[PDB]
Structure 1
């Protein structure tokens, strides 16, 4: 076997658990259509957001 050398495990201590995730979001409303992710890895930052 390949074991799980190539996967996360995070074993459960209760069936059917869940995972949370945090996105930093700019554009006043963190929950809005079109709001943007502050640290998205593919998309660059709005270099002028805090400036001009």
Structure 2
């Protein structure tokens, strides 16, 4: 009903800062939920696999 309309999106993420680069989306259809953030992952820091 008016030119140049708008539409919003509601990316839900987990992390201290929801706008920092690299934040992972919470309810992603392709990406499985990180089922350690609310669990043991809050107690320690698991290193990530890499090369060598």
Shorter-chain TM band:
0.7 to 0.9
Q: Could you report, residue by residue, the CA deviation over 1:1-52 in whole angstroms, capped at 9, with x for unpaired residues?
A: xxxxxxxxxxxx1001011000111111110111010001000111000000
> Where does structure 1 differ by over 2 angstroms across 4 or more consecutive aligned residues?
none
Total equivalences in the alignment: 40
Q: What runs of 5+ residues in structure 2 fail to find an aligned partner? A: 41-52
Map 1:1-52 to 2 at 5 A. Answer: 13-52=1-40
Normalising to structure 1: TM-score of the pair?
Answer: 0.72
Higher helix share: 2
Q: What runs of 5+ residues in structure 1 fail to find an aligned partner? A: 1-12
Structure showing greater radius of gyration is 1
